[PDB]
């Protein structure tokens, strides 16, 4: 039995008190304003941190607790999931003889919001939360997503450090996890993923993982929803590989 959310589900157990005022006065749930989000710089990377006092943080936390934790995922996703760990990502490959490692460039920034809407649509009933103005799914994504002030062109963005961003990333990438897992299985390759770092291993005596064809195929798949492969971190070795020291 899949998880379904209706108006009462949002109003009673999700919102509780964060958006009581909006639901009693039938006022639209607002966007996450820049006042609630502080912009940290770490390296060349930029992190977005929400303030705890805002009701959006609390509703994000209860969304993570009660909603995003029930949607089924793909077993190749070993990160940000209950029971998933790096050692699990690095284990299925002990059976392999040749190893290859790929990376997705700016995984969290390149997640299209429309893909998130499409991925979350079957698990949320299509209703009108606030009169005839804002739908329930629209309110939930208003809680989850954010608009980047630095780059207003790309519009709504799932930012780094928004509590619910990792689970949403796993859910929205389940489609590609299935596609790439099917391709690798038909090629006889063991596949696993941690966040955006993808690891493939061939247990047979073959040069498939060292060929340009494999990279081209994975990139061609990743272009379906607009991802790209970081060419600097691409690695392919035989009989021994080292990933971040392991």
């Amino acid at each position: 039995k899949m998880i379904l959310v209706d108006k009462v589900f949002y109003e009673k157990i999700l919102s509780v008190e964060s958006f009581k005022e909006n639901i009693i006065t039938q006022s639209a749930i607002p966007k996450i304003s820049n006042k609630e989000v502080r912009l940290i710089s770490s390296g060349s990377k930029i992190f977005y941190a929400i303030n705890n006092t805002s009701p959006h943080s609390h509703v994000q936390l209860r969304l993570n607790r009660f909603f995003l934790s029930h949607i089924p995922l793909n077993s190749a996703a070993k990160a940000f999931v209950r029971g998933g760990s790096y050692l699990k990502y690095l284990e299925p490959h002990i059976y392999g003889s040749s190893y290859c490692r790929l990376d997705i460039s700016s995984f969290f920034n390149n997640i299209s919001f429309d893909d998130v809407k499409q991925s979350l649509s079957p698990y949320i009933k299509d209703e009108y939360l606030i009169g005839t103005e804002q739908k329930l799914i629209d309110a939930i994504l208003n809680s989850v997503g954010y608009e980047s002030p630095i780059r207003k062109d790309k519009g709504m963005i799932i930012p780094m450090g928004f509590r619910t961003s990792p689970a949403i990333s796993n859910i929205v990438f389940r489609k590609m996890d299935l596609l790439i897992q099917d391709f690798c299985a038909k090629k006889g390759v063991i596949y696993s993923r941690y966040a955006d770092d993808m690891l493939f291993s061939n247990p047979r005596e073959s040069k498939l993982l060292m060929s340009d064809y494999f990279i081209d195929e994975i990139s061609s798949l990743l272009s379906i929803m607009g991802f790209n492969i970081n060419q600097s971190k691409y690695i392919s070795r035989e009989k021994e590989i080292s990933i971040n020291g392991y």
Binding site: P72, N74, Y95, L178, D182, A185, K186, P203, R204
Partner: protein
């Protein structure tokens, strides 16, 4: 060994399950619908695909995975020793070398090969079968000869005892054919025919002509190896059809037939696997179905007898004892007798696997501790202890009174969930050697004790003293020895005050029957909150004190009224004249106590009296009820004193954790003890036989209370809330156990 590990990913009811560290006997236990036979189906499909049979692929646990994987890690150390050696130059050995261990020693160099040879040899062969979403199957080794040879070397023998054909034991022979390996080049079909013809002929040559005719007429296919060995066995032995103890199978029973079938097959397996390097894996479902408990115990006993008769150790050696590894025997049972005998007769060579299907639907496999270092516990191990393995929630208690309470039928009627929890009284040494904390995740449990086991207050010194159990609990609870900061600061504070409590002193009142300001309830609550992490619950007082609180005084008193009205009779065969004589000699008002002593006495049988006798008895009983009400409310200042007196009479403890016997020995509270003895010997003599712990007063009390409150209130939620109010202690423990059971 035979199999190092078995891993299933996303097939049937398994999400990601790995089974390893197999022993000689592997008992599989678990609730209905947890996947115990799903392991059988997975292994059976893996071995069917090993021999390139055409079968339907198994279903995926969830369809959000594009793959489903089965991994088998065969242990080929002994086969490597067998075949690598220069003496074994046979053709089967040469095939095994050229198929498995060639192309694996090819890649290694001289240094690594010599290191493998000289050191402790440990070689494994990992084979992975992956089922894609479109029903295609892909192996990790693309040489079918390797897979066929692996199937031959490590055969899978498989029985579902439920669907056994009792009256035809033919499937035994096939399995025997799988076991033993030897040479057949020398035996042709010409020498045998000549031998038989020479033996069977009044004129030489006739039988050969007959066989030539039969061969010429028919058209057949050359024998396979297994058919060859089966034919040679069946010709060699005296009889083919099976007979149970001299009687035909169809006349015998069904349980006897199944028991004998399984017994002969397992005996043949262990007997015949001694001399060969073929290491089978055998899987029995329900080895106990249709078997009397005595028969299941005898089945396991005979299995262990055969197992130990061929086992060679440093002490046992000589003719008939082999070092050859035993086949891996899995059997899934739902019978405590099978598990009990397995544990008691195998010890360190058995393993108990617990299968539980969680909340989402995945199967979890855990290892339950079944090895005990205490010989006394092994000998005293019985059906009651082995029943614990099948429990869902174990509530360990200390005395028999808790067993009497928690097993109450009426009480369990209103709390059906707690009916699934087995209560087992555990001594400290028994609780130590059972090791229920090792399982925890597999079989959740709770240990229920009294706070007296922690702190022993002294009335003379006005000091608490810490029992060694408290020090040991604190020692496990001072986790901070090698840790990092967490939200455990409250825990450290609580342990600090628990250590501080030793130096503090508390005054007592009424010669040591109450606390001036210390709240034992608060200390109990803090202790339970802290020690919930250790699955231990401590009650403020004894169980009798838990039943008899200040709030339970009315209903209990009503019970006294009822025990005053119904269950005594007149102690004379002539109720009329006897009641008249006692009314004459003893007054109604001045001498009511001796009159009731002479007239009424407790009796299970209730003879029917005349209406006037009933009226007189009712008037006397009502007068005695009023007199007892007045006397009880007069001789005791407040309700608390009455509750304490009732607790002490039945064998409870005071607020200072002192029993009646303890108070008598120490000599304190002379006035209260004298009042209690006076009430027992003068007014409450009829309740004196029911004063003891084992007298069963708890059962009658709870039954009457439940019946009365159900008479008062109809709704079941109302009745449960009334129970929670009236017994805040017991209902809390039942609620906690039920909540842990539900999840």
């Amino acid at each position: 060994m035979t199999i190092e590990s078995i891993r299933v990913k996303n097939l049937l009811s398994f999400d990601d399950v790995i089974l390893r560290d197999f022993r000689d006997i592997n008992c599989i236990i678990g609730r209905n619908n947890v996947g115990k036979s799903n392991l059988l189906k997975v292994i059976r499909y893996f071995y069917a695909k090993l021999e390139n049979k055409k079968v339907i692929p198994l279903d995926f646990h969830t369809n959000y995975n594009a793959v489903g994987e089965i991994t088998f890690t065969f242990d080929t150390t002994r086969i490597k020793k067998i075949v690598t050696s220069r003496k074994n130059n046979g053709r089967f050995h040469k095939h095994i070398y050229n198929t498995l261990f060639k192309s694996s020693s090819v890649k290694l160099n001289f240094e690594e090969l010599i290191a493998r040879k000289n050191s402790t040899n440990k070689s494994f062969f990992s084979l992975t079968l992956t089922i894609c979403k479109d029903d295609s199957v892909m192996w990790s080794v693309d040489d079918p000869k390797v897979r066929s040879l692996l199937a031959t070397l490590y055969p899978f023998l498989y029985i579902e005892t439920r669907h056994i054909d009792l009256y035809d034991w033919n499937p035994i022979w096939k399995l025997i054919s799988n076991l033993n390996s030897f040479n057949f080049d020398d035996v042709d079909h010409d020498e045998l025919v000549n031998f038989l013809d020479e033996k069977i002929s009044s004129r030489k040559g006739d039988y050969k002509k007959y066989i030539d005719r039969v061969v010429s007429v028919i058209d057949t296919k050359p024998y396979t190896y297994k058919e060859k060995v089966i034919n040679y066995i069946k010709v060699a032995i005296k009889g083919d059809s099976f007979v149970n103890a001299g009687e035909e199978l169809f006349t015998q029973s069904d349980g006897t037939n199944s028991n004998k079938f399984l017994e002969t097959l397992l005996h043949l397996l262990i007997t015949l696997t001694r001399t060969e390097f073929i290491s089978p894996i055998v899987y029995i479902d329900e080895p106990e179905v249709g078997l009397h408990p005595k028969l299941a115990e005898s089945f396991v006993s005979n299995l262990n007898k055969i197992y130990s008769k061929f086992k060679k150790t440093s002490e046992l050696s000589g003719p008939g004892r082999y070092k050859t590894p035993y086949p891996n025997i899995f059997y899934s049972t739902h019978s405590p007798s099978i598990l009990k005998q397995t544990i008691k007769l195998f010890g360190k060579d058995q393993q108990v696997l617990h299968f539980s299907k969680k909340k989402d639907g995945s199967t979890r496999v855990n290892k339950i501790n079944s090895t005990y270092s205490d010989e006394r516990f092994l000998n005293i191990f019985s059906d009651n202890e082995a029943r614990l393995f099948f429990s869902e929630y174990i509530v360990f208690v200390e005395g028999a009174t808790e067993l009497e309470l928690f097993r109450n039928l009426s009480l369990l009627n209103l709390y059906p969930a707690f009916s699934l929890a087995d209560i087992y009284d555990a001594n400290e040494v028994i609780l130590a050697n059972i090791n229920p904390g090792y399982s925890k995740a597999s079989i959740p449990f709770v240990i229920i004790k009294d706070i007296d086991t922690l702190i022993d207050y002294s009335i003379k010194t006005e000091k608490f003293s810490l029992r060694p159990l408290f020090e040991k609990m604190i020692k496990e609870l001072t986790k901070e020895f090698d840790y990092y900061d967490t939200g455990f600061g409250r825990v450290r504070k609580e342990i600090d005050l628990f250590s501080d409590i030793q130096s503090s002193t508390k005054k007592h009142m009424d010669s040591g029957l109450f606390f001036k300001r210390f709240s034992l309830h608060n200390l109990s609550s803090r202790i339970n909150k802290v020690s919930r992490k250790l699955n231990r619950y401590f009650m403020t007082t004894t169980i009798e004190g838990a039943l008899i609180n200040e709030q339970s005084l009315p209903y209990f008193f009503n019970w006294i009224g009822d025990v005053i009205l119904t269950q005594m009779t007149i102690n004379n065969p002539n109720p009329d004249k006897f009641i008249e004589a006692m009314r004459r000699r003893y007054n109604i008002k001045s001498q009511v106590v001796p009159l009731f002593k002479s007239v009424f006495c407790i009796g299970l049988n209730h003879p029917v009296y005349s209406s006037a006798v009933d009226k007189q008895a009712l008037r006397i009983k009502l007068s005695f009820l009023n007199y007892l009400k007045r006397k009880v409310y007069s001789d005791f200042n407040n309700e608390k004193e009455i509750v304490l007196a009732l607790r002490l009479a039945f064998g409870g403890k005071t607020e200072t954790q002192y029993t009646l016997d303890k108070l008598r020995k120490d000599g304190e509270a002379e006035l209260f003890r004298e009042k209690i003895k006076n009430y027992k010997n003068n007014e409450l003599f009829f309740l004196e036989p029911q004063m003891t712990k084992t007298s069963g007063w708890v059962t009658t009390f709870l039954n009457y209370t439940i019946e009365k409150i159900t008479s008062e209130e109809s709704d079941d939620d109302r009745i449960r809330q009334k129970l929670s109010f009236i017994f805040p202690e017991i209902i809390s423990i039942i609620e906690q156990a039920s909540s842990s059971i539900e999840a």
